[PDB]
Symmetry: C4
């Protein structure tokens, strides 16, 4: 509650939560988050066929159990762009957080730094860098930009992020206009508070505004020059985020990207597009070790983390389930989810004969041509 | 008391409507359209498995989002057979618009004309040429014939169509007898008004007749000679409509057709046949640029428009959604649907990196061998 | 009803019926046929997945509409083994009939005879040859044997069939023991009346016996020798019925069979087996024109008839739909079903460009690798 | 009651039961077994998609009915490792029979020896060996272990099994940690019984062990040396159980395994893995006759037994259906299930043309590329 908060009443309770599986968290969160903001978080484009595809894609490649593999206390730690992290997942950049919990991004930040991974800060955060920093307590962070049409504004934002301690920049390029998000349209959803970091290029405050109008204020005519100019201007490794087609990965690397972030924005953008995990092997094969790959869009289980790594990702990024955890328990709730994914992965590692994160990368997967219904 | 009717009570309200997606228009229209007429419009052959196939076919080939493309305010305009149109879609020829709205084909014509595309006029209109002309106000029109058995009556229909200003003729050849339309059979659907363009070759004057008997007063024994003779007589470009097999595209072109219209009649004809979109690539490859291709049967989204163009259609034709929009709001309801399609396509163009309609034609699509269920 | 029934109240009413599709006939028949007999007729082995397979197989190969073909009043007539028949379908041998209607096999016989096709008489009829002959009125018939273990009894049965007027013998070889018919097990189904043709080797009545014990009385150790011997003894062309594997077709033909009858007994026999129509092309390719093929198991629509002919069958045999028609209206109800199939096929011929039954045999079908769910 | 067990209200009645199919037994047993313990038996990892895969896999390869095969009274008997058994299925090792019935493993042992097959005894069974031995009354038995961390404990348990007359050892190696069994977590289920067969050999991390913490307390770091050592120390043929990947079959054999036991532990272990049946042919082809194969996980029908044998298994092992039978009627209920499988297989054998169990191994199966939904 600052200049924004009105009749939007986000949960405020802080507690650890029992996570049996992350799927149940959606319905659980529907009972604590205001209808508009909940459906903004949970919903996807069209009739959500592609979000369902993100989920069902994991049944296309199945894990073998493996035995007498000489493996005992699996270690989930890994390293990406110099950061040593407790497990091979990071927090995806997500604009929402105040929609889910009054402690907002600072809540998520505390869970992420206490767990021991990397926080990605969305340009569309409801919290300032200062507020997020207090939650991170010096933990690592990456900053995600939605580009302004005005170059000076981009250079200011990047300077603020770097000054704040960002050690990579995430260029989200799959959102030059909004997806067709039927739930938000039908609800007439509107952000109930401000976006302090991108404020400088919105007609007024984000507060009364639709997402369609926030994107749209952003840069539509993103080109490979933008990738080069952001890497050049910031001193920092640049990820290009939203990639589903291998030619865009070759393009981004040749334009100076230091990482490829394979994603379909959790199916919130282009409708009637593939499940994200289905696109990963061809992108990995084109990238061919040139830069690290972050994978997201549909990760719900430790099995999914293992499959992504076997298929070419260095790490995955987590989204909705952590935000559902934040709704239900603030920072401790979000931490419960992160802790669930580590323990879930540890079980999968033991059963697949994987001693460490590198072993996961060499797993052979069973191909399932029958799909979901088998 | 309106002296023309016995008792069919079509909606008459004129207003713009919201359109979140075109699928919802179906149930909304069922609320205002008399039962028999509504189910004539919505229904299809058999248990409607092929109507479902028309819709599920769109998931067989998926769009890639593409980033850093160098794209900003896409332009949906295109040209076909000399007509500059505002978007790469036209109005499909559909019988008896009076079943949907009291303004009938004049209402449709007004929406189509004002939006900026081509009107196709069904030989089975409940409206005269002069009535539809008042709606078009000089806008482009194509005339779709259901042939008479008698050559002179076809010459006369063609002469009237051309005198009215028709700039192409559409020979619909997939309806030599009716499909097995179970809804219409169970409702005992009969037309509540006459059809002035084809009245000449009906024994009666269409009002209490079944479609079964109307088709079937029309010509059953269509042969490639009819294509030659229609082309010869009415020296306008001829489309052969209803094509699903590539051999028929080649046959029609060699018989003098100037266009191929790929369609299964919105699944109202042959049952247990493929979804129309699945047939398109093979027809396009056989046509091999010789004449333009119109594609229809199941187009509901901008994504579908894009996939059709990427797969070799020059434009698509829209049917049910526009007629539902007419039911709900007369010319303004129909206009709202066309406007929806233009804006829906624009988003898709932006997210796929397509600056113009030509760029759409060059899109690679992701093959999805899993089905609808993924 | 006859002098056997324990207390079985079969319908007796004789009327023509409106058939919109044959699938609705199943539920309509359930309202008038006693529970036990109804589920004996409608049911299949296990959880009926293979009966479902029989029906869904028809979606694996899809018909193309064809246009400007030069076609007008399609002729359904054909000829098999010297019989000129009105349409390319015959009556399958069915041991039910008095379970469906008090007029029994004589009622079905009258419908088939008046329609103008071939009646197949089951060895497990609840009617005598003389009873069936009065219904047939000189109409053509084929006799289906369930073999006795004793040779002499088989000779006696074949002689009675031939002296009755049988012009072919159908050896059903796929029922050496009963399928696992869950409905009949749970209903404790037992025949309410006798089976006069095979009574000689039952040592008793079929009345109050289970199908398991009746099948148990017929011959289990059928070998190729039985094919040779039946052909040798009778004057007659012998079909082997129940064939799903191409090697059995080659075997049957080399053992003296004059026809191959592709069937899985309407899924009443071996469970977790393919849909019948999926097995047909490989049998046809191996038969390679040597003898005529009859196809059954799942035929519900004129499209199914077309597909089977296009895939190598000379005729199809009809079963459950006709018996449901019999339950509903006696011979007139059975007739309404035959007449429906004739008209249904006529529509399909016109839409596919088939002037006659030979033209159907040359149709190409579209392969649908996606399932039923598309 | 044993004062040392947690109170648990298992069924105690003993009666033969009617078995129409094994699937209906699950629901029937749910009415008499305590909720927690019932769901422990019935449930599986995650949302149970891999348990469903186990069941749907059987629809990937379909049986052909075969005719004129000269077959009459099929013989289900077979032999494995010198044991002559009445049918090609054995009891799978399961430690939790007392959850189904108060007679625990002694009840199932009675059914299994009365029927004439092999009883697999979990070392961690609820019943005492003397109780189980009384049930077996001399019948053949195999013993299943987990590797303990403590080597001496392994030697002691193996000696115990050999002195108890075990003629083979089953090393279950797919459970180095527990699967994610949502039902048990959600039900807060605590397994109630002790482990009298091995209590007393329990050392170190295994001290105070129960099924509640077996997995964690036993050996995680199993290597091929464990297999060698077990085979070396024991006199006996050793099966390695839980194999789904062909490399693991080759490893186990090269390490001295006398048998490969293909299994996913009834889907109670690794989630989002293939259905067990789908893994079988690749394992069989790699084994290539070196040692016998036991197959389990999803066997519910005689058709499944036949498909497994056709696909390279020597025998299958049964689990859940036998426990549901034990719940419903003690040893006689369990016996009714074994007897059902024997009759079910006999019918399949007759209809596939298989005179004996060797013939089943020669069966060609029909590949069904469409899925379960056909
Ligand atoms: C509530 C919501 C808000 C999001 N906001 C952003 C954003 O500000 N910037 C961005 O790059 N991605 C954003 N994303 C996309 C995520 O970074 C990520 O791609 C997505 O959450 C992965 O899908 P999943 O959560 O279903 O696994 C958002 C996603 C959701 C769920
Ligand atoms: C209500 C209705 C009437 C139609 N009438 C005609 C007609 O008179 N002539 C014609 O060529 N096609 C006619 N069609 C077929 C359409 O031209 C077009 O093929 C179909 O609407 C496309 O399928 P869709 O509307 O589901 O997208 C009709 C379709 C429907 C919905
Ligand atoms: C009620 C019932 C009884 C049958 N009785 C016999 C029979 O006595 N002899 C035989 O060869 N086939 C018999 N059949 C199999 C049929 O000949 C035929 O293969 C089956 O009806 C085709 O399946 P469909 O009716 O589902 O299309 C019977 C089928 C059913 C429906
Ligand atoms: C309740 C339950 C407990 C089990 N306990 C063991 C165990 O003690 N040791 C073992 O090797 N397998 C165990 N299994 C796996 C079985 O040996 C067998 O692999 C499984 O039951 C096969 O799956 P199905 O029962 O669904 O056909 C258990 C399975 C279930 C059903």
């Amino acid at each position: 509650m600052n200049n924004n908060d009105i009749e939007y009443n986000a949960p405020s309770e802080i507690k650890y939560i029992d996570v049996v599986n992350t799927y149940d968290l959606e319905e659980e969160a529907s009972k604590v988050v205001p209808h508009g903001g909940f459906n903004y978080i949970a919903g996807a484009s069209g009739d959500e066929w592609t979000k369902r595809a993100n989920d069902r894609a994991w049944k296309h490649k199945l894990l073998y159990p493996r035995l007498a593999q000489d493996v005992e206390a699996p270690d989930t730690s890994t390293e990406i762009l110099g950061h040593k992290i407790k497990a091979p997942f990071i927090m995806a950049p997500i604009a929402a957080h105040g929609l889910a919990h009054t402690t907002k991004e600072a809540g998520t930040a505390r869970a992420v730094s206490e767990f021991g991974t990397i926080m990605s800060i969305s340009a569309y955060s409801g919290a300032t860098f200062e507020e997020i920093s207090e939650g991170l307590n010096g933990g690592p962070r990456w900053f995600q930009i939605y580009m302004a049409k005005d170059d000076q504004q981009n250079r200011d934002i990047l300077d603020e992020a770097k000054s704040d301690g960002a050690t990579a920049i995430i260029l989200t390029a799959d959102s030059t206009v909004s997806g067709n998000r039927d739930r938000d349209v039908k609800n007439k959803f509107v952000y109930p508070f401000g976006m302090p970091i991108v404020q400088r290029y919105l007609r007024g405050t984000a507060e009364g505004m639709s997402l369609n109008n926030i994107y749209g204020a952003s840069k539509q005519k993103i080109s490979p020059r933008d990738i080069e100019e952001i890497a050049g201007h910031s001193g920092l490794p640049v990820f290009v985020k939203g990639i589903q087609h291998p030619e865009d990965a070759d393009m981004a690397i040749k334009r100076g990207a230091s990482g490829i972030w394979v994603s379909n924005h959790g199916a919130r953008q282009l409708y009637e597009a593939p499940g994200s995990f289905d696109t990963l092997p061809a992108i990995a094969e084109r990238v061919n070790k040139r830069v690290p790959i972050v994978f997201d869009s549909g990760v719900r289980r430790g099995e999914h983390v293992a499959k992504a790594l076997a298929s070419g990702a260095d790490v995955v990024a987590l989204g909705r389930p952590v935000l559902f955890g934040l709704a239900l328990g603030g920072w401790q709730g979000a931490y419960s989810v992160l802790d669930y994914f580590q323990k879930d992965l540890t079980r999968v590692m033991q059963l697949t004969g994987s001693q460490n994160v590198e072993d996961l990368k060499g797993l052979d997967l069973f191909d399932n041509p029958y799909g979901y219904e088998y």
